[PDB]
Amino acid sequence: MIQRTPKIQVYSRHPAENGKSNFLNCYVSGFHPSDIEVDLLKNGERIEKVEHSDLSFSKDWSFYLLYYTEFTPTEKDEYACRVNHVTLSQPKIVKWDR
Amino acid sequence: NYNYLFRLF
Amino acid sequence: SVDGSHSMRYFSTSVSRPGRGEPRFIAVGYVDDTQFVRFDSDAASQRMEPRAPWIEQEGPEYWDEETGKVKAHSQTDRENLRIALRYYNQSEAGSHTLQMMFGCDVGSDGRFLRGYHQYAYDGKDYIALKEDLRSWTAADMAAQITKRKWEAAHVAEQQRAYLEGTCVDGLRRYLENGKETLQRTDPPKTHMTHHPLRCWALGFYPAEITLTWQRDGEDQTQDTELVETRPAGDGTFQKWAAVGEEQRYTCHVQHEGLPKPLTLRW
């Protein structure tokens, strides 16, 4: 059958890099089947409390999920997203940028 | 309102 | 959208769990781009749960009746997952997925427009009710067997009644009760950055949006990058577009929530 690789976007909820509360988000989309592992990473360590939305899918039947954890960004603190899927030979890690 | 009738293949 | 049409969608996913128990069933309900109900077979409540503030204004008979219908779906698609194994001559050790979408469209005035009733097995079309809400589109030889049965049992008529009746009646009610929330728009917040540049639209609802690049007033397709619309987690969405050589380019943003299409000054 046709397996679709996940599209990964790690990004901040509201605009912020300093003391103001926001939400770190890793939106995975366009993948099939639904078994997916999304880990938000802080300086290489898994953040424990990461919630996610209910599973849904697009017009092409491919799934999308949003994983989020409440955070207050600071200038220096670095974040990341680690996503493993059946289509992935090794976990793919995307680092938060802008 | 969900549907109330579901059929088999 | 721009038509002023509104839509109700119910999405369901069933994933078989061979050796680990019965299949996982997730069902989600959306009005336009706002989810309002959900049902997860792994949850302890075993009942349809609210996910939007305006669906809680419904009566207590609603939550009992809706729960009974989504549970019937989950139990029906569990046998359908097993029927598919026989139709496709597949083994009981493989994990497989069955997806269903149904719902209706209404216009700005609230009149019935379109109906939907489609299935997918392992992420590809299985069977669909056609737009006439009277005939079926079968994608493979397996779905032809199901199509013949559903023609003999006259399933199209039973669905066409729901899509034109109970379906639209609910969407109307959800739209009015969610007037303060559903019939509104969030204009995008635009900003631009430069790297040895890209426009940003943030906090917009609905998700329908178009980002255009024009150089000297001419449409620019090459050297341009556009990412898919993303949710922020607050009910609004985000999207950005990108393209030494500079100043001569401009980003143009169109959205039903914008008073005028926006042009970005680098």
Residue numbers in the entry:
A (entry chain B): 0 to 97
B (entry chain C): 1 to 9
C (entry chain A): -2 to 193, 201 to 247, 252 to 274
Question: What does the publication say?
Answer:
Here, we studied an HLA-A24-restricted NYN epitope (Spike448-456) that elicits broad CD8+ T cell responses in COVID-19 patients characterized by a common TCR repertoire. The HLA-A24-restricted NYN epitope (Spike448-456, NYNYLYRLF) elicits strong and broad CTL responses in antiviral immunity. Our findings indicate that these mutations have minimal impact on the epitope's presentation by cell surface HLA, yet they diminish the affinities of their respective peptide-HLA complexes (pHLAs) for NYN peptide-specific TCRs, particularly L452R and Y453F.
Clear and continuous electron densities extend across the entire length of the MHC-bound peptide, allowing confident identification of all peptide residues. The structure revealed the strong bindings between HLA-A24 and the Y453F peptide. The most substantial deviation occurred at the central portion of the bound peptide, where the α-carbons of mutation site P6-Phe shifted by 1.7 Å. Both the WT and Y453F peptides were anchored to the HLA-A24 cleft through a conventional orientation involving nine hydrogen bonds and one salt bridge formed by P1-Asn, P2-Tyr, P7-Arg, P8-Leu, and P9-Phe with HLA-A24. Interestingly, compared with the WT peptide, the Y453F peptide establishes more bond interactions with HLA-A24 helix via P2-Tyr, P3-Asn, P4-Tyr, P6-Phe, P7-Arg, and P9-Phe, forming eight hydrogen bonds with E87, T97, T167, Q179, Q180, and T187. The solvent-exposed side chains of P4-Tyr, P5-Leu, and P7-Arg of the peptide were positioned away from the peptide-binding groove, composing a moderate surface for potential interactions with TCRs. Structural analysis indicated that the Y453F mutation may induce a non-functional conformation, compromising the interactions between epitope and peptide-specific TCRs.
